[PDB]
Ligand SMILES: CCCCCCCC(=O)Oc1c(Br)cc(Br)cc1CNC(=O)c1ccccc1[N+](=O)[O-]
């Protein structure tokens with residue numbers, strides 16, 4: 001399933017299944033973020049996951065939506081962006097990397113979300129890996145599954161979030 | 164192998180690469196169709212693949228874009244729709260399925276495409292098989308690789324269709 005996310009009964013069970021799927025696949029931290037079509041800000045955002053509260057708060061308070069290189073990437077692509085040194089170009093972006101790392105989120109990837117009704121978002125997952133080599137090996141072995149996952153999460157989440 | 168789609172220059176080589184990748188996954192016929200954001204007709208569509216010419220012409224002339232259940236599905240979902248007379252209901256819909264079958268396009272699936280810039284389209288692929296059960300086994304066996312392929316085709320195809328000189 002393949003169906004279990006769509007066949008979840010409400011936000012709570014959806015969130016838990018999503019987090020559990022991620023957990024089973026090997027990702028201890030996930031965040032699904034979705035905005036309605038042509039959103040001006042994040043006032044109508046549907047954001048669900050198990051990222052630490054302190055980090056969620058820090059990201060909001062620091063305005064990191066405007067710094068985070070995965071955000072801009074999502075506006076330009078349907079392909080995943082892996083969390084690697086090359087995506088952090090400016091000192092501001094390097095600072096974001098360091099703060100995310102301090103919060104425990106070092107290795108991972110962000111999958112852009114583009115819904116059939118203009119929904120815009122991202123599914124981010126972090127793996128608690130020993131090092132970059134181990135992180136990449138793990139991520140390669142799960143990537144095709146995660147690629148299907150992001151679209152199922154999008155289709156179901158959008159239905160749950162905006163109708 | 165996905166890197167080859169960006170590496171290519173021109174509609175011809177790109178389409179050839181995509182067709183080969185699809186063939187390697189067990190699909191002998193494919194159609195990649197993509198419209199720019201908020202298109203009101205198909206005049207500005209980018210449509211490439213190896214569906215037979217006669218079928219392409221008939222589908223257009225008969226107005227099957229308004230009948231084909233995979234088309235309406237693509238406007239509503241990011242998930243694939245498998246080709247099944249179950250997705251047919253109306254008179255024209257069984258006409259459509261009958262004519263598609265006659266053209267040799269019986270089993271397959273359509274993967275909706277929703278681009279970062281509002282591009283809307285579909286990657287449709289047909290699989291040759293002895294029966295639907297076998298067709299389903301062939302398709303399920305490659306679904307994760309196809310899922311990646313459709314997004315790689317979308318990202319590279321949108322550039323080729325609408326952006327690159
Ligand atoms: C405009 C497009 C719609 C994007 C809609 C929001 C998508 C989203 O969830 O962005 C967030 C938000 Br809101 C809060 C946090 Br905290 C994190 C993100 C996404 N970024 C990452 O997950 C990320 C990415 C790289 C490195 C570290 C991290 N991280 O947070 O630990």
Ligand SMILES: CCCCCCCC(=O)Oc1c(Br)cc(Br)cc1CNC(=O)c1ccccc1[N+](=O)[O-]
Pocket residue numbers: 194195196197198210214218219222228231233234235237238246263268269273283284285287288
């Ligand atoms: C508005 C969003 C759409 C986006 C528009 C692009 C989708 C597309 O390419 O539709 C077509 C077109 Br144009 C011509 C033909 Br011929 C076929 C399709 C899509 N349908 C199938 O491939 C299909 C589907 C089911 C059964 C048989 C077939 N078939 O043609 O053999």
